[PDB]
Amino acid sequence: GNFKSKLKKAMLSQQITKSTIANKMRLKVLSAREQSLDGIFEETKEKLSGIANNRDEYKPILQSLIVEALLKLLEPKAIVKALERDVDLIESMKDDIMREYGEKAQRAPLEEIVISNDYLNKDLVSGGVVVSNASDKIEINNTLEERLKLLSEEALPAIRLELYG
Amino acid sequence: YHSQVVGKIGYIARCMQTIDPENNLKKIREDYQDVLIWAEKNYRFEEILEASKSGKCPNDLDALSRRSLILLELLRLVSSISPFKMKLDLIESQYEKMKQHVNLWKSDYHVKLNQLNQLTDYLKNAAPTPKNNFLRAMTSVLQMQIAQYGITEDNEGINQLFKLGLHLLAMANEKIDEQYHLFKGYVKDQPEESPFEGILPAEDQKILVKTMIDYAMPKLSSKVLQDKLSALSSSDVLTKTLLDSIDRIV
Amino acid sequence: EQKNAGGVGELEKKAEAGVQGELAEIKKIAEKKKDDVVKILIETVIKPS
Amino acid sequence: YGAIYSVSGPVVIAENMIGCAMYELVKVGHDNLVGEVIRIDGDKATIQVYEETAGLTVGDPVLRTGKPLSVELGPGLMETIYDGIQRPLKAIKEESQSIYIPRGIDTPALDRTIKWQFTPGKFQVGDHISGGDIYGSVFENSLISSHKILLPPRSRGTITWIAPAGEYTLDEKILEVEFDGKKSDFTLYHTWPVRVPRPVTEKLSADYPLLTGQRVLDALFPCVQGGTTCIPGAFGCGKTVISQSLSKYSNSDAIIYVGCGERGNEMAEVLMEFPELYTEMSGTKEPIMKRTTLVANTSNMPVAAREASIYTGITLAEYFRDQGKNVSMIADSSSRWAEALREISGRLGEMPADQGFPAYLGAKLASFYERAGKAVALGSPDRTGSVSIVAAVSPAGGDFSDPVTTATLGITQVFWGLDKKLAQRKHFPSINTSVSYSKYTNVLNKFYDSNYPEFPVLRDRMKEILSNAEELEQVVQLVGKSALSDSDKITLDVATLIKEDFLQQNGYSTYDAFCPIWKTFDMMRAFISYHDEAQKAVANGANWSKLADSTGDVKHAVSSSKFFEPSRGEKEVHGEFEKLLSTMQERFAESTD
Amino acid sequence: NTVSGVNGPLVILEKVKFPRYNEIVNLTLPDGTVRQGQVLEIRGDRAIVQVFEGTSGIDVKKTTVEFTGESLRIPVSEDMLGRIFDGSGRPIDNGPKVFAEDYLDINGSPINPYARIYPEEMISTGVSAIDTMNSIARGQKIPIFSASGLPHNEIAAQICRQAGLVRPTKDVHDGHEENFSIVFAAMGVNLETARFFKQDFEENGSLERTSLFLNLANDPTIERIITPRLALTTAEYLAYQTERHVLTILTDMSSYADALREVSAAREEVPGRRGYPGYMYTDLSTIYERAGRVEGRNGSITQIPILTMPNDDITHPIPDLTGYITEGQIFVDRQLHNKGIYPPINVLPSLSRLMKSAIGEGMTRKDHGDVSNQLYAKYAIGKDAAAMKAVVGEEALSIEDKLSLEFLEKFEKTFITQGAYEDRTVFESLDQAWSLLRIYPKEMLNRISPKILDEFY
Amino acid sequence: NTVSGVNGPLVILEKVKFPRYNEIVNLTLPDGTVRQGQVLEIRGDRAIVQVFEGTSGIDVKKTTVEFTGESLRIPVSEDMLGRIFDGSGRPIDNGPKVFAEDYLDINGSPINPYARIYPEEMISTGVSAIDTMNSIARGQKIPIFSASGLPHNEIAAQICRQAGLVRPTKDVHDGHEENFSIVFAAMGVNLETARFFKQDFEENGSLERTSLFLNLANDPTIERIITPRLALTTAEYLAYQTERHVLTILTDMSSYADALREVSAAREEVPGRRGYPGYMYTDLSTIYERAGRVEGRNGSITQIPILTMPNDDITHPIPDLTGYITEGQIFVDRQLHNKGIYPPINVLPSLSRLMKSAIGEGMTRKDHGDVSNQLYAKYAIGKDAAAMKAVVGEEALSIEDKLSLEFLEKFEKTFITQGAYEDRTVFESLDQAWSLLRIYPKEMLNRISPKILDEFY
């Protein structure tokens, strides 16, 4: 009567160890998939830094991103925070951003673009600009790192079905 | 999150460096090479926190708490056995046995070292008394037998000395008859003749024999019995023949 | 009871060796089409949406 | 900055408050009254004060200090009785001339004149530190010296300045930590929010039993250090004697007594009864007062101190559990805290949804039970700690349909019964075998198998005999006494001695200071062996009067065995348990033959 | 300054918040009559004040207001005993004034005279069943619970006169170590019951050492609740200043709770359970806060609240809310008064958790608390056997049902049977209660120790 | 970016009206902790949303606001087993991410897959009395009714842990020919019960086939009420997309009812009778609308809700509203759990209204329907004989009351008695019930056929 209980205890322990290994295998596979996604996101951010490092080719993409942020803000006066080399490009393309924003929206164009004194660096974002309301009511991050991180949640199903289908 | 992992890695490296200062335990330091490698190099805390947050270093709070509990139990067992010294292979065998245990925080090995450290901690701040002297000699014999036998092998003397130390510690300050009767009964039932030579001081055996001769001396009424009891209380060894001769004379 | 004393610790070696072949086929397919998803992620990140 | 917009009752509203959080404390009016803004509505914030305001006008200045309102954590908490807002009533009793919470006076929770002996640990200059790490130690009392001074949570850096061992006050610096530049200086006292719980490294399973001294409470359900248990009330049936006798009978390293809605006489009697009584740890010089933390909150005081008393007690229990010691938290009653929250919701103007109580009282009451429990201690040392949550429930409506007992019954894991008819018959503390549950009996059975305890096997048969005794007594009283088997009479006879020996407590037994597990487990073996011997003797052929007369002195000795101590013969087992095993075979053989 | 609006009995005036909260204000109407009021609630650019003298005569813009600049405080002195006052502190015969020499708050928070000590001196109320089963000490706030359809005011005045008449025999027994004082507070009581209580207080010999407060149902609700704070402040100031045991009677609590419930029906406040205000526990806790032993170990203020059950149930918000803050309870029974037992008080649902702390050796018996446990179980078993004997019949009762039924009829008609002016000591109540218990053998009692039970059995 | 105020669990923030209803928002405070939540309502420059982590501690004019631009949805995938998650779809193991492949909504129905097929193909989950006498199938629901006198959370953890082991023995009997999964949802549970249930489920070897959802009692009510939507969408996505039988266990219903009753404290909606809201039928119908047979039935989505009554009263709409929508009910007795039996379920009041439709030929036993009726009639006759045995006595008891009384005591400890780590199928439960029913004679057995009774005696 005691030996049957001891054999039942050992039979419970082996079934615990087999489930522990059976969980460790799927934990290792999930760690490998998370490492592959963590490498793909690092490659996308590394390409986004070098793509954001060129203001001549990034000027129309930054103007289209500023028009995309102006199409969601819906305000005639907003503060645009960007890098030290992006304020001069937006200052010389504010009329083109207003003319391009006027042709893509039914509302009137912006009156003026407030160039803030906060200059972002390359150690915090991968490029882009931050468009916020002038009344202190909403903040919209339109950077490359925030756009890739927020777009990765919706692009994760096509990447998962295309990579591990 | 990362500050507890960096502080646990620094405390694990400090406990690992304080455990073996001679570099003679390659088995204990071999398993902690992944955490001691980042602590043995001069680096900033921001680099260790950024490396731990990016998946480039150990960041498991459960595994670091279990390994820090096992290393804290081995360092607490090695530090609790002073001034005696344990064997080099016994520390690696106790570390290998504690590493292969399913639950080191729920077993009796941690409670035995916690009670052994609590007995010396309570006896260090306490004044010199007979129960503190008997509990100090039982804690010294339990420290010598615990250092000689480890914490991975069961023993009746360690459980009886721990139960007698817990029962003597749980008693009040008006129970000297039960502490003297428990010390005389536990000392009379020991297999060895005197467990105080080379482990206790020379004045402690004469203080214990003078305490037992002074305790048994107030019950006598003859001059020959008081002369023999006063003459037998000048020995520097606590043997069972002195207690049997003192009990036969009374 | 001797079989339940040597199995502790071997669950990680037996679980790591069981998923060793899956990590090479998953790493080869993940490393093969890395540019096709990085170019689509950079193209979608560089375009307004 | 701010102006008093409206003042009604004990709560004052202040308009023109922009930039303040939901936990920052500020002074309202010109008297400098203590208060904290719990909620806000627009530009006007509603701040609950811990003192009854009666001479404050609308329009006075309200300046926030710029930090949250909490209590100080350091040496000097034991051997003193404070209020629910961390205010020393001992200095306010002689200085302010009032033993209750004063009005218009300010007093710190930690005095700057008391000095303690501080000693540094094994750390040195250059080692990294984290939140809850063991930085030093300070001897608070003469019995326990495990009061290690730790850093606050959410902090990190390196030790730039290390102080040596010696005697210093709480206002003197002993350590400095800066990670990125000079952050700030460190001292013996630490700041922590009362509304914010203390963080931990990881949770642990509850497998360490805790004996409160009650044989019926531990026999009915397995009490463990780290679990959640509730106590039913009836508006006064002897619940304060179970809390004071349970706190004095407990042998934990820490004691957390916090009164939420007490009248005030039980807190003064429990505070004065602690120095005259002695503990089971060989204490001296007020051992019962120096080993427990006294938090005195009465119903005559404000509802802010009564609502923050549970947060200060849970923060002190979280600090004591993070220190590396097991503490038992005793709270009574939760109905005064829920009635104070309903009074704050009714006074503030929030619409309730609990039949008169606030809708947020369920999440706040359920969130307090999740903070207590056993787990690993936070910090780099990884010490072992535990916290027992014992909160007695009171009536706030119907008998069982109250929102405090209904919302608290779901979050709890251990439940004990309470006889309403037996409570009025002078039979407290009583329990109900039909209304009871416990989830730590399965995990406690594994450690009980290693400890060789037989408590649950006799507890299941005692619960079955106590369950069948109510049906036999109700069927005998309803149908009438005209015929019955000997099994129901022997079960009612065993349930009468078991209910007399286990039910009668707090004035019906000589030895009630300490209750060992071997005496409680071995005590049920005599009643279960007598009931099984009587049922086996009646089943094999025998008369009821021949077996009842065949028992004789064994029934009176088994009923009178509770008055004897377990210190006879051995250190954990009495001689009556060993003699009853040999006399039970002769009584069972003589009763059958 | 000007009356902005009026909702029910409260008047909402529009003016700047110059005066403080609870300060007395002066309202002048254009009829040749001035009235005084106190601001119950302060707000921005508005204040809610309740006029003590009537509720009629308000004007839209033909009235003026004046700020006194002082908070609401009642002057207490050592010579106010032996005078007739009102709920606001004014006489009704134009005789004795306030004559205050010290400043005291209307809530008792700024003093806090409750020392860290429990009740030890047992005060005998002259009832063997009341002091035996639920005996309280000096400082206990355990009130007497009553019900509708019975004269609870005559039993409360008879117990109040019996406590003062039993205090002289208990003074030599070490039950009371100071003088005896009486506090009479009226709220919604008739003139015949107030004149009968004043005639009982004058017959007891406490007319020149007590204070009389008169509050009728036609007066304001703020004056009735304001009178118990002034009576408790005068009793706490006299008991703390002179070191004398003062007994305060606050009747009726249902009118004070009805005034607080009526005050919440004229503003915008969320109501609690049972259609009552949510801040009634904070206002009720302030009246119960002024209670306990004074600092010095020589004085204490005792409060005995008289609460009448309107629905005949203890689950009401007013009786349950006031009973939840207080310790213990004593409920009367209409069947005891209908049977002929005077005073009718039930012992089945009445139980106190502080009877052991109030009791003690040298002023009572040791087995008095032990006999109440067996007497309560015998009283419950007598009611269960009496209900089972009438419900099921005489053919379904047991052997213990006859002895419990005879012990319930003998104990219900022997212990609770007494007069209205005869004092009953604790030793006579324990000796007369021990004789009624001897109806069964020694093998049927288990709510007492056999050592103390064998010595007195 | 400008928080207006906070009242209860809902925070009132001032933001633009561009965010949609149920959109995720990130609240950035000045302390250094970012918390996410869901917008409860959107208006014209005003809205009230509930934060997932905390409800207080944010500034009024210093915090920042940000909109993610995605609705509240959890990614459904086939790798959700073998991991621990939270009530908002966040893993607490500190390991890899979810890595889902489809976007499924959590606040509503994505496609609402509910086939119009009858209930059939019944499968067991580890309960002998529950699966035997009131065994439900894929498409039908059966709730568990308990009270505050038994471990209903440990009974739900043992019922969820017992599932998955009957699929190998049932696969040979043609009862399950596909992958089986379990859905574990915990709301208002502690860390000791979740860690003990996770260690108990991982010790048996069922952690790799079930999902772990742990919700704490210190989180918002929106996460606790939205926690079963991820389990219902994961079970519907795994059952429809994978064609496998998945069982959903949701405990406890009292925490979801208290969280739903605590909500709506600052809106125009008011609660109904008994303090609960009047829209509990739509809340239970919303969770019941995402379970059952999908279009193209290959797998099954079984819903087994465990409800624990806090007072054990029948005057609440929790058990009546939950039992009215389902077909059948299971009751648990405290007297059976007090004796030591596990699980202490009673088959006398419990009955199944679709038991004959769930059983058939090829996926269940043939004599299971007559064996459950014979065991129920023998249990009712054993309860009547046990109740009449005390009044009649031992020497005057009938042979039918003693034979049924022995079958009630033997069947109560044999059929209802099961192991915590042992899995008993319906075939072993029918063979165990045949041994308890074998003590009766053949003439006293008339609730089965003669061929099945002669073959299985």
PDB file of N, CA, C and O in Angstrom, chain F residues 22-38:
ATOM      1  N   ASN F  22     -13.554  52.850 -28.353  1.00  0.00           N
ATOM      2  CA  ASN F  22     -12.804  51.640 -28.036  1.00  0.00           C
ATOM      3  C   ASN F  22     -11.389  51.660 -28.605  1.00  0.00           C
ATOM      4  O   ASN F  22     -10.762  50.610 -28.768  1.00  0.00           O
ATOM      5  N   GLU F  23     -10.874  52.847 -28.911  1.00  0.00           N
ATOM      6  CA  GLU F  23      -9.526  52.977 -29.444  1.00  0.00           C
ATOM      7  C   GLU F  23      -8.512  52.986 -28.309  1.00  0.00           C
ATOM      8  O   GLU F  23      -8.781  53.500 -27.218  1.00  0.00           O
ATOM      9  N   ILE F  24      -7.339  52.409 -28.570  1.00  0.00           N
ATOM     10  CA  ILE F  24      -6.284  52.365 -27.565  1.00  0.00           C
ATOM     11  C   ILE F  24      -5.628  53.735 -27.453  1.00  0.00           C
ATOM     12  O   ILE F  24      -5.407  54.426 -28.458  1.00  0.00           O
ATOM     13  N   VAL F  25      -5.312  54.135 -26.223  1.00  0.00           N
ATOM     14  CA  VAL F  25      -4.684  55.419 -25.950  1.00  0.00           C
ATOM     15  C   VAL F  25      -3.549  55.211 -24.958  1.00  0.00           C
ATOM     16  O   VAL F  25      -3.611  54.338 -24.086  1.00  0.00           O
ATOM     17  N   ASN F  26      -2.504  56.022 -25.098  1.00  0.00           N
ATOM     18  CA  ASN F  26      -1.328  55.957 -24.241  1.00  0.00           C
ATOM     19  C   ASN F  26      -1.265  57.230 -23.406  1.00  0.00           C
ATOM     20  O   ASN F  26      -1.126  58.329 -23.952  1.00  0.00           O
ATOM     21  N   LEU F  27      -1.367  57.077 -22.089  1.00  0.00           N
ATOM     22  CA  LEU F  27      -1.313  58.197 -21.158  1.00  0.00           C
ATOM     23  C   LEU F  27       0.093  58.280 -20.576  1.00  0.00           C
ATOM     24  O   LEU F  27       0.526  57.372 -19.859  1.00  0.00           O
ATOM     25  N   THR F  28       0.797  59.365 -20.883  1.00  0.00           N
ATOM     26  CA  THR F  28       2.157  59.584 -20.410  1.00  0.00           C
ATOM     27  C   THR F  28       2.117  60.545 -19.229  1.00  0.00           C
ATOM     28  O   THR F  28       1.705  61.701 -19.377  1.00  0.00           O
ATOM     29  N   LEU F  29       2.542  60.069 -18.065  1.00  0.00           N
ATOM     30  CA  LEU F  29       2.563  60.864 -16.850  1.00  0.00           C
ATOM     31  C   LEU F  29       3.968  61.375 -16.574  1.00  0.00           C
ATOM     32  O   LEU F  29       4.931  60.976 -17.237  1.00  0.00           O
ATOM     33  N   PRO F  30       4.123  62.267 -15.595  1.00  0.00           N
ATOM     34  CA  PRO F  30       5.447  62.810 -15.276  1.00  0.00           C
ATOM     35  C   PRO F  30       6.265  61.966 -14.311  1.00  0.00           C
ATOM     36  O   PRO F  30       7.372  62.374 -13.952  1.00  0.00           O
ATOM     37  N   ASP F  31       5.759  60.808 -13.883  1.00  0.00           N
ATOM     38  CA  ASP F  31       6.509  59.970 -12.955  1.00  0.00           C
ATOM     39  C   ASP F  31       7.498  59.068 -13.685  1.00  0.00           C
ATOM     40  O   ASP F  31       8.562  58.745 -13.146  1.00  0.00           O
ATOM     41  N   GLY F  32       7.164  58.653 -14.904  1.00  0.00           N
ATOM     42  CA  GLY F  32       8.043  57.799 -15.679  1.00  0.00           C
ATOM     43  C   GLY F  32       7.432  56.449 -15.993  1.00  0.00           C
ATOM     44  O   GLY F  32       8.139  55.512 -16.372  1.00  0.00           O
ATOM     45  N   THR F  33       6.114  56.339 -15.839  1.00  0.00           N
ATOM     46  CA  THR F  33       5.387  55.101 -16.091  1.00  0.00           C
ATOM     47  C   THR F  33       4.283  55.387 -17.098  1.00  0.00           C
ATOM     48  O   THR F  33       3.435  56.255 -16.865  1.00  0.00           O
ATOM     49  N   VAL F  34       4.296  54.660 -18.212  1.00  0.00           N
ATOM     50  CA  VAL F  34       3.296  54.804 -19.265  1.00  0.00           C
ATOM     51  C   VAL F  34       2.256  53.706 -19.101  1.00  0.00           C
ATOM     52  O   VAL F  34       2.599  52.526 -18.953  1.00  0.00           O
ATOM     53  N   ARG F  35       0.983  54.092 -19.126  1.00  0.00           N
ATOM     54  CA  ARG F  35      -0.124  53.160 -18.969  1.00  0.00           C
ATOM     55  C   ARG F  35      -1.067  53.294 -20.156  1.00  0.00           C
ATOM     56  O   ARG F  35      -1.350  54.405 -20.613  1.00  0.00           O
ATOM     57  N   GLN F  36      -1.548  52.159 -20.647  1.00  0.00           N
ATOM     58  CA  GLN F  36      -2.472  52.117 -21.770  1.00  0.00           C
ATOM     59  C   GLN F  36      -3.892  51.856 -21.278  1.00  0.00           C
ATOM     60  O   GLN F  36      -4.111  51.285 -20.207  1.00  0.00           O
ATOM     61  N   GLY F  37      -4.860  52.286 -22.083  1.00  0.00           N
ATOM     62  CA  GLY F  37      -6.258  52.119 -21.751  1.00  0.00           C
ATOM     63  C   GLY F  37      -7.114  52.137 -22.998  1.00  0.00           C
ATOM     64  O   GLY F  37      -6.611  52.181 -24.122  1.00  0.00           O
ATOM     65  N   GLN F  38      -8.427  52.102 -22.786  1.00  0.00           N
ATOM     66  CA  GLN F  38      -9.402  52.109 -23.869  1.00  0.00           C
ATOM     67  C   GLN F  38     -10.361  53.268 -23.655  1.00  0.00           C
ATOM     68  O   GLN F  38     -10.789  53.523 -22.524  1.00  0.00           O
TER      69      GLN F  38
END
